[PDB]
Amino acid sequence: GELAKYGLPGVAQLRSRESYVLSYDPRTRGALWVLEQLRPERLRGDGDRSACDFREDDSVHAYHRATNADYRGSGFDRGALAAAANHRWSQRAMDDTFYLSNVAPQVPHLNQNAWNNLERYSRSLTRTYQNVYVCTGPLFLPRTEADGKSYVKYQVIGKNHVAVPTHFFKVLILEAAGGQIELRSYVMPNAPVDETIPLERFLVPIESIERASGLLFVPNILARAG
Amino acid sequence: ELAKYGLPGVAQLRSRESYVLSYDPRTRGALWVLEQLRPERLRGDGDRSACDFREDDSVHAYHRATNADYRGSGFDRGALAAAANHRWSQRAMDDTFYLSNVAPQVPHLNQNAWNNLERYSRSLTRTYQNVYVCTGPLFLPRTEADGKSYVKYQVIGKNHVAVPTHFFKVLILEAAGGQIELRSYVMPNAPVDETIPLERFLVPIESIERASGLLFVPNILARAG
Numbered sequence: 001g002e003l004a005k006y007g008l009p010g011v012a013q014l015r016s017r018e019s020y021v022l023s024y025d026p027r028t029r030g031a032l033w034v035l036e037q038l039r040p041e042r043l044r045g046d047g048d049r050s051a052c053d054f055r056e057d058d059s060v061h062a063y064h065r066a067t068n069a070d071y072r073g074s075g076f077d078r079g080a081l082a083a084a085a086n087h088r089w090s091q092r093a094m095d096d097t098f099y100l101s102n103v104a105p106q107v108p109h110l111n112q113n114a115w116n117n118l119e120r121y122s123r124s125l126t127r128t129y130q131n132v133y134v135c136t137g138p139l140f141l142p143r144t145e146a147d148g149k150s151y152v153k154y155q156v157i158g159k160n161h162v163a164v165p166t167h168f169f170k171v172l173i174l175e176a177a178g179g180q181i182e183l184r185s186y187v188m189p190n191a192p193v194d195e196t197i198p199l200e201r202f203l204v205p206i207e208s209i210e211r212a213s214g215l216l217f218v219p220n221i222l223a224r225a226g
Numbered sequence: 227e228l229a230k231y232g233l234p235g236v237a238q239l240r241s242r243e244s245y246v247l248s249y250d251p252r253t254r255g256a257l258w259v260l261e262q263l264r265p266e267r268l269r270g271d272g273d274r275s276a277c278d279f280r281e282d283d284s285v286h287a288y289h290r291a292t293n294a295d296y297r298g299s300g301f302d303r304g305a306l307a308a309a310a311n312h313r314w315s316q317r318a319m320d321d322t323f324y325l326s327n328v329a330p331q332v333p334h335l336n337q338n339a340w341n342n343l344e345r346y347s348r349s350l351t352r353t354y355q356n357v358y359v360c361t362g363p364l365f366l367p368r369t370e371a372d373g374k375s376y377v378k379y380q381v382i383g384k385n386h387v388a389v390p391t392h393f394f395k396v397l398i399l400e401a402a403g404g405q406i407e408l409r410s411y412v413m414p415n416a417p418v419d420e421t422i423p424l425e426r427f428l429v430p431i432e433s434i435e436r437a438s439g440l441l442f443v444p445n446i447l448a449r450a451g
């Protein structure tokens with residue numbers, strides 16, 4: 001009827017970029033998830049860019065838009081979700097990974113070491129799988145406190161209150177030569193992670209990522225396999 | 227072929243008989259619930275026992291608040307679209323008892339100041355042609371002794387249902403001629419003193435928009451044109 005006469009206050013904010021598609025959460029001022037399709041034939045190239053040349057996303061309303069000022073002085077890196085080095089195959093592809101809508105505040109040690117390693121390993125799977133789908137996003141995990149109750153606590157940085165994830169997830173969909181598809185899901189804390197711990201140790205059941213993140217992967221995958 | 231395996235997280239709009247809702251599976255709660263109150267719809271024989279809430283089976287069980295999440299938590303199942311807005315139809319009233327329409331609410335707040343705000347909003351149908359009501363949770367930051375800002379909120383039950391720190395209610399007041407007035411309230415999820423006049427909880431709509439991630443004024447301006 002006439003219920004939506006004045007519109008709806010919010011709807012899904014999908015963004016298609018050259019290198020990824022993301023879903024944006026204006027409450028946290030960051031993406032819910034970012035989706036990439038890596039493959040060996042559309043991976044390497046001449047693209048390059050300064051490691052620090054990130055840009056705020058003018059397609060996001062200013063009330064809900066993360067800025068470089070939000071990160072300045074916070075002690076966090078602008079941690080990209082869709083990695084720049086996945087997309088040197090075109091300058092525009094690589095540039096799009098520097099929208100702040102594709103980054104979250106990331107402990108610098110993590111960004112530089114164990115997360116970097118995981119991104120590098122993910123890229124390397126294109127040498128032995130036809131396609132490597134990568135879905136990357138934040139987590140805000142509850143913890144139990146000494147009063148016996150459970151709470152979600154996270155920092156928010158800058159005037160725009162950009163949320164600092166407690167953890168990050170990364171889901172790989174590995175398309176092997178002809179048909180057979182394999183699923184690998186990792187979680188790391190937003191913390192200095194020992195770079196020598198084997199990445200295997202950070203695998204988790206996909207369902208626990210689904211539960212915590214509010215997202216669903218397995219049903220879409222079973223649906224595609226039919 | 228980027229979407230070959232679908233997208234893992236898109237808007238969960240739900241249309242019910244009494245309201246439209248947008249759902250957050252992360253917090254296991256609505257982002258907002260939108261109603262249109264009119265004087266006829268207040269009246270009706272609809273009734274329902276005050277505690278008869280049902281889990282929403284249109285929500286994946288991983289992300290679905292249940293009655294057991296609330297049991298023993300010390301919080302009420304605080305409805306967002308109020309049952310009493312919808313006595314005009316038993317089905318309309320029934321739909322307000324889906325848990326997707328509720329958030330953990332301090333019992334005192336649900337019973338007193340929030341109830342009063344709901345009764346007041348209902349009463350504006352006597353003097354406005356339409357009363358639109360958008361209700362939802364807030365999770366507002368706080369500044370700790372280190373000068374940094376954090377969001378902290380409890381989660382209750384096995385399904386970790388988020389306990390909002392505050393609630394917002396936006397009224398769109400539509401007169402015939404002279405037209406549209408906007409009025410927006412915020413209350414902490416706390417035992418608010420019921421003698422505090424409701425007007426003292428008015429906040430600028432921009433502050434709700436900033437904190438909630440939602441936009442109201444752009445849509446309001448577009449319809450005026």
Ligand SMILES: [Cl-]
Pocket residue numbers: 054055056068
């Ligand atoms: Cl910029």
Ligand SMILES: [Cl-]
Pocket residue numbers: 052076077078079
């Ligand atoms: Cl940085």
Ligand SMILES: [Cl-]
Pocket residue numbers: 083084085086
């Ligand atoms: Cl990179």
Ligand SMILES: [Cl-]
Pocket residue numbers: 153
């Ligand atoms: Cl604390």
Ligand SMILES: [Cl-]
Pocket residue numbers: 153154155164165166
């Ligand atoms: Cl944090």
Ligand SMILES: [Cl-]
Pocket residue numbers: 227228229
């Ligand atoms: Cl595509």
Ligand SMILES: [Cl-]
Pocket residue numbers: 279280281293
């Ligand atoms: Cl039930």
Ligand SMILES: [Cl-]
Pocket residue numbers: none
């Ligand atoms: Cl049951």
Ligand SMILES: [Cl-]
Pocket residue numbers: 277301302303304
């Ligand atoms: Cl209750």
Ligand SMILES: [Cl-]
Pocket residue numbers: 308309310311
């Ligand atoms: Cl009621």
Ligand SMILES: [Cl-]
Pocket residue numbers: 412429433434437
């Ligand atoms: Cl506020």
Ligand SMILES: [Mg+2]
Pocket residue numbers: 078079080111112115116
């Ligand atoms: Mg990085």
Ligand SMILES: [Mg+2]
Pocket residue numbers: 304305308336337340341
């Ligand atoms: Mg109530």
